[PDB]
């Protein structure tokens, strides 16, 4: 009948070294199948084929990936879910290490 979505487990923080690929992954659970956005700075991320930010989103799994990170990508980055049931939102702080 329906079953709001919820995150299942997100870390709250993450160092990497500077130039490495950063992944960030999260499980979520929701019926229908919840819509996943990324956002840093209320702005939505959508992944670039030809650049270095990529989403890969299953029926259950949202990845994150960063290749090459830099300073810069260091942020508060926010996961949201939504269905026609409820949303849910979490956030993981990302720290580039020198």
């Known amino acids: 009948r329906g079953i709001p ?4 487990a997100l870390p709250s923080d ?5 130039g490495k690929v950063l992944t960030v992954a999260c499980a979520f659970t929701g019926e229908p199948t919840p819509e996943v956005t990324w956002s840093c700075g209320g702005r939505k991320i959508h992944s670039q084929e030809q650049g270095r930010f990529h989403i890969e989103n299953t029926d259950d799994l949202t990845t994150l990936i960063i290749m ?7 942020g508060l980055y926010t996961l949201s879910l939504g269905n026609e049931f409820g949303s849910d939102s979490a956030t993981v ?3 580039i290490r020198s």
């Open 5 to 8: 979505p919820k995150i299942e």
């Open 93 to 95: 702080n990302i720290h």
């Open 14 to 18: 993450i160092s990497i070294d500077e």
């Open 68 to 74: 090459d990170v830099q300073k810069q990508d260091g």
